[PDB]
Amino acid sequence: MGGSGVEGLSGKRCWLAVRNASLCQFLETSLQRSGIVVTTYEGQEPTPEDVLITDEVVSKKWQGRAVVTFCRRHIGIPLEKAPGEWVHSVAAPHELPALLARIYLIEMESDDPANALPSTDKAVSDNDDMMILVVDDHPINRRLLADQLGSLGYQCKTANDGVDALNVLSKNHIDIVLSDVNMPNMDGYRLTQRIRQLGLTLPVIGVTANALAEEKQRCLESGMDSCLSKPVTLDVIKQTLTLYAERVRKSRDS
Secondary structure, rough: OOOOOOOOOOOOEEEOOOOOOHHHHHHHHOOOOOOEEEEOOOOOOOOOEEEEEEOOOOOOOOOOEEEEEEOOOOOOOOOOOOEEEEEEOOOOOOOOHHHHHHHHOOOOOOOOOOOOOOOOOOOOOOOOEEEEEEEEEOOHHHHHHHHHHHHHHOOEEEEEEHHHHHHHHHOOOOEEEEEEHHHHHHOOOOHHHHHHHOOOOOEEEEEEEOOOHHHHHHHHHHOOOEEEEEEOOOOOOOHHHHHHHHHHHHHHHH
C-alpha cells in the first residue's frame, strides 16, 4: 500500500572527474561499498549536496557540497581554506576515501583511518554545529526542503525511514528532527512510540500533507512538538527553525 520506497543515504551521489584510472577506480569502488553512486563527471551540473572528486589542478569551482583535488604533479586550487575544498597529493591510500565517508557520516565500514602522518596540526573549534535531520517519504520533496535548509546555512542531513530516524539520534546528535509525510506507505505509530521509548530528547516537527488524521494521532502519541503542512514555505521553515534554535539556546545556554 502506498509504495515501499526507501532512500536515505543509499542514492547519495558522488561525481568523479579522475583521468587517473588507478585512483579513479580505487576511490569509486570504495565509495560504492555502501550506497553511494559514483558517476563520471564530464559536463554535469553541481549540486550543493554533491561532491566532485577530480585529479590534478582543476579549473572549476564546483558550487556544491565539497570538492576533492587529488594532486599528481601541479597545484592551483587552494584547499580546506575554502568552503569545501580538500587537496592531497596521493594515489588513494585510504585516508581521503575515509574522509568522504566521514563528511557523509555513513561510517558503515570500520576501517580505522587514524593518520599516516601528522602533516598539519588541525585546531578543532566546534560550537556552531546545529544539525537538522529531514526524513521525507518523498525524495524530491526531501531535497526541496533540504534546499531551503541549506539556504539558511546549517547542517542538513537528508534521510528517509521511520526507524532510522530514531536510529539517527542514537548515531549522532541531531537537534531538530523533521518528519515529512506525504504518502502513507508505512504505519507511523511504531515511529513515534519507538522514538520516544528508546530515547527521545529533542523536539520533533511533524510536517504532513493535510492534517486530517495527523492531529489526532500526533496528539495521542505526543512524540513530536510542532506540526506544519507538506507544502512548507521558506519563511515558515525559517521562523520555525530559528525559534527552535533559540529554544535549545535557552536549555543549553552558553
